[PDB]
Design a protein around this nucleic acid. Structure first.
Lengths: 191, 191, 191, 191, 191, 191, 191, 191, 191, 191
DNA sequence: AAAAAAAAAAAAAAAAAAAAAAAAAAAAAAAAAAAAAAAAAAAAAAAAA
DNA sequence: TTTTTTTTTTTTTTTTTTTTTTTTTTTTTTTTTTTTTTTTTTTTTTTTT
């Protein structure tokens, strides 16, 4: 038992600046966590700083969100990218927007898609595509339409300010985060 | 005997942050493990952290479930994906939903299935299909119907909250986890 | 002599986490190995961890069973699958259940079997079939009836709890393990 | 001379785990090799591990048998199957039991045999048949009677425990091993 | 000159395990080669391992026999079978024993022989027959009597232990090896 | 010019083991080639290995004989058999000994010979006969007497050790080799 | 034009070993081609190897003879036999020597000759006869005397070493080659 | 149109070696075709190789002769013999020389000629005779005198070197070729 | 309808080389068919090659002559001979020239002609005679004079180059072709 | 019924080239059959080719003439000659022209006619005579005058181009065809 | 009854460099093998420009 | 620029046996180089029961 306590104390002392920065950023921010127990907020900042993911706004790697008076540590859509890059096994990641009259055919069985880029008749988007390929040959491609993204936003999202000014960025972020979370390979320790 | 103790101590010291993160996440969670022996919970967290599978909720790789006052470490449906990707011998993994009037014929002997996608008469699903192919030519395909999935859920599952709002996700997860567990090739050490 | 000792020590040090995981899982389990010599259990865990086959329950690759106060390391019905996949020469493996009024004829000399699937008059099973085919053209097919499986279970099996709730799974597992052990090609090192 | 020593050392270092597993299995077994020179046992384990044929009991590929105080490495009836499959030129191998009133005629010159299967008057066996066919058209068929098998067992076998409980398995194993050893084509390196 | 040296070195390095196995088997055997030059034994093992014919006792493909203080590599009666099967042009090979009152007539010009099998008056053998047929229509048949085999054994063989317990096996082996050596078609590289 | 050099180099690299085996067998043999230029011996071994005819003693397909200080590659009496079998157009080849009081008449114009076999008055040979028949109907028969064979041996052969112990084998070999060389159809590439 | 070049290159690559063997045999031979252009020798070896007729001495199918400083490819008296056998339409070919007091009468119009064989008064030859018969009924017979053969040898032959030791063989070869060249039917591709 | 092109291409590819041999023989020959268009020479070699009649000098079946700067393919006096033998309907062909005081009478109406052979008074020739007989009873006989042959040679032949050394061979060749061309039955495809 | 198309296609494919040879000979010839439709020329070559009558100049069996811009296939005076010989019912065919003072009398009713050959007073020809006799006894004889032949040549022939140098050959050819065409029996398929 | 269909199909397949030649000749000809049903033309060509009588113009054995929009197969004046010769019972056939002052008397009862040939006073024809005699003694003679032939031509013939340039040939053809058709003996199968 | 007829003459061919051998043969009979511990679940998501 | 949810297991233990035998032989080549020549000629008519 004392050995685990000493190891935990050493780990805690090794990562003081991240904890200090997270606490200072939380203090300097707005006042929306005043209805929750401070112990939960401290624990959330602790676990966030343990994973080398500060809570500073300029990076957007993690957040603290209160649920029923309890603070929860949450991962952003760039934390998955950070973990995937820390894994060190990826080769390519990309996500683009398919406009009107670009794709030719697409079947979900063989995951084969063909497009005719730089040949458009209008200036409105029709769908979005994402694709990531590893080093050992594994590849994955997904394609979403506007209706599915709208349904997902209506079902899950509970805000409308961000989705109004820039519709494309939120859709791209959702596609990227879903593709990376569901099928990606993640790791914690950098190699 | 002392050599094995030194090796075990070195292995323990090498993976402290995962153990710390798992313990902190368990502490910050709800109070449902208070009726079990803490030693079993500590051992379960230990073995979970040994396999590079943290117990944090944002990843969903493993769980701790108490059975008859004894805590047990359990693998999720993404842990199999993680192990398969760590193996480094796969080429493709996929699972889709076959809607009404899509498939033509299917026999379980030769595992040959043909479908006519993008040609539907209704908007209700009829079945689910899964398919994974390796690099050395080995392929595997499975097909489930709604009745079999309903029977499996009635026989094994003991909850109904998740199965109500989104029926398709649970069926896809069950098909994927069964196909990967029964016939897949798994490994622990990354290559 | 010293060179072999150094090589053995290096091999031992290379595979510490598997040994640690196996020992922890054995400790966390029930108390049924207390009537045997601990040295035999340690040796069995050692050889099990040497072959990249952990003893964790969630995988079911190997077991430790005591016989006359001596612990023995045993291979499950998925260890054969793992070794066959590690070989890298297979093309297809399958096992199905032949119901009432499905097969037409079957002779054990030429190993030729014909069936009329999706055309049944009842809902009771009559037999089981297994078939595996390699890449270089070698194929093997076996067919068992209910009477033979019942006789085998009565002769060899010494438990009845598992065979009661689900009769089909045990029969399929027995057919698969027998077909893979008697006629399959196995290997230890992954290619 | 130094070049051959370096090559031998490299070959030895390449196959350490098989040697370790064989030695551990020999140690964990019963005490029947204590009347022989340990150097011979070490050499036998060495040559057994050189051919990718471990000595573990669960596989039954090879054995170590002491003769006049000297240990000898011996091939089982599955080692021939393993070598034949490693050759990669086979198409079919089979062995069955001919019961009472099944075969019609059989001549040893043209190796032509005809049978009327699934038409029996009793439940006692009369003989055994074996047949293996290659890819380039070469085929071989053998047929043994009960008297010849009994004479062979009396002449060569020196134990009776195995032959009592299950008479058919030993006869089938003898037919298979004799047919594969005398007329089969074997190889060491996998292709 | 350097190119041939590099090619020879590559060929030597490609076939190390066979050489190692042959040397280990020679070392583990009895002490009868101590009166000969070790260089000749090494060269004989080298050429034996070059032709993919190990010197292990369990296979019986080749031997090393000392003549006037010089070791010589020799082919067994199964090496001819191995080479003939490696050729890939054969269709059938067989050898049987003709008992008393079985054959009717036999002339050595047209090589036509007729027999009445399964009709015997005694239980003593009278002669032996061998027959091999290729794919392109070429066939060859030979027939030996007891007197000729006895004369050959007296003239050439210099041992009597093997010929005493089992007279038929040695005669069959001699007929097979003579028929395959004198008239058969052999090859070294497998096709 | 470079293309022919590349083709020759590829052909040389394709047939290394035969060259290595021939050189090793020549080295392990007696010392009778020490009075000749090594370049001629190397060239002779090269051409011998090019035709898939190794120089090993156990086969007796080809020899190296020095003439006036120059080594020459020579074909044995089995090389003709090998080439004829490689041709793939033959149907039957045979050679027998005609004893006293067996043949009735023989004329060299129509090549018609009749004999009364199995009816002899003495045990001394009188002549030898050879006969080979193709598939397209072409047949050839030759008959030699003792006087002609003795004259040929006196005129051409320059040794007497072999001809003393076994007179019949040398006569049969001479008849076979002459009949196959003068009138047979030969080919190099196997079909 | 490129198509014919590709076809010629493929034909050249298909027959490399014959060209290599011919070149090696020419190199290993005596030095009598040093006064001619090497290009002509290379072309002659090329055309000789194109017709599946190697230039090796042990076969005697073709030769290279220099005329006025130009090498020429020439057919031997066995090349005609090889081509005739490749045709596949022959039934019988023969040539014999008619001794003193054997023939009775012979007219060149109807090509009818009668002889009384095995009835001689001396041991000196008087003439030679040749006869070949096809399958469709066509037959041809020729008869030469000693004077005509002597005149032909004096007129055409320019050497005397071969004609001295063995007079009969050269006469038989001349009769055979003339009869086969003037009236025979030849072909290049084997059927 | 494409079908005929494919058939022509297949026919061309089937007969490459004859074309290659003809071209190589033409290249290796003297320089007398340098004043003609190469396309005509290529076409002539093509048609010559199409009819299974190579242009090699050792056979003398066909020639290429330039006329007014245009190369022409020409048939020799042995090509007619080859075609007649390919027909498969002939029974006998012959041509002889009638010397002084041999024939008795000859009339051109009934084609009846009688001679008294082996009864001569001088050693000078007087005429030539040719005779060919089919299988169905058709026969043809021709007889030429010296004056007619001399007139034909003066009228048609434009060279004198060949006609000087050997007068009889040219006359026999002319008689044979005229008799076979004017009245013979020819065919292209062998039967 | 499809059956006749398949049969026609098979017949076309069976006779490709004749068509190819005819087309190549037509191409290599002079330019006199450039004023006609190529389809007619192709059809004429097709029908000419269908009847096993190539259009090569060295044989002179058939020709292509343009009439009013339309190519026509025409039979020569040797095609009738070829067809008559293919019939297989003829016994004798002949045509001679009757000189001055040879014939005695000739009447056209009974077709009886008598001549006194080898008794001439001048060296000028007076007429021509032709005679052909079958096997079943049918005979036919015709006799032409110089005036009738001159009248026929003036009426029908439209060229004078051939008729100038050799007057007898054209007259003999006309007599032969007229006698064979008007009264002969012809057939297409060889028997 | 199926047997007759198979026999008809075999007969059709046996005579393809004649049908092909007839169709090609009809196609290459002029356009005068375009007003008739193609089925009738095909049937007429079929029956014409069935009787071994091609429709090619160079032979003139048969024709196709349209009558009231229906094509009809017609026999020429040489088809009767062909059938009569196929019968094999004839001995002589002839037809001549009787000029002015040649015949003496002629009565139609006894069919006796006498003429004084080679004794004429003018150069104009007066009549025509025809005569054919069999082997068994049967003879037939007919005699026509100019008036009867003119009346027949006026009554039956409907063209005048042919009858103008050559009056004698048409009269001879009419006499021959009438005499052969009315009184001759005809057959279809050759004997 | 639809039948009259022709485009045909000819050559470039003689011949040889083949006789032959170094092969007789053996070290091989066979065994240690029968099979079991297996069924399954905890999962749906979002905070971003 | 905005804050959730859900549930807890089960079974069972082994046996069998050990070897043998024996070693070689044979020897050596030959011979010789070529030739000859180059074309021609000409194109449609007719009908229907």
């Amino acid at each position: 038992a004392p050995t685990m306590r000493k190891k935990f104390e050493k780990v805690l002392d090794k990562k003081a600046p991240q904890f200090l920065t997270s606490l200072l950023n939380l203090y300097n921010g707005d006042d929306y966590l005043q209805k929750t127990d401070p112990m939960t907020v401290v624990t959330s900042a602790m676990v966030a700083a343990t994973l080398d993911l500060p809570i500073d706004k300029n990076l957007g790697y993690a957040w603290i969100v209160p649920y029923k008076g309890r603070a929860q540590f949450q991962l952003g859509y760039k934390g998955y990218i950070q973990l995937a890059l820390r894994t060190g096994q990826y080769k390519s990641i990309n996500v683009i927007e398919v406009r009107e009259g670009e794709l030719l055919k697409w079947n979900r069985l063989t995951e084969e898609i063909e497009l005719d880029l730089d040949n458009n008749t209008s200036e409105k988007v029709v769908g979005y595509c994402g694709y990531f390929q590893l080093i050992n040959g594994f590849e994955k491609t997904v394609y979403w339409t506007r209706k599915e993204i709208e349904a997902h936003k209506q079902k899950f999202s509970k805000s409308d300010f961000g989705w109004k000014k820039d519709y494309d960025a939120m859709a791209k972020k959702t596609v990227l985060r879903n593709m990376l979370s569901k099928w990606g390979i993640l790791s914690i320790d950098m190699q």
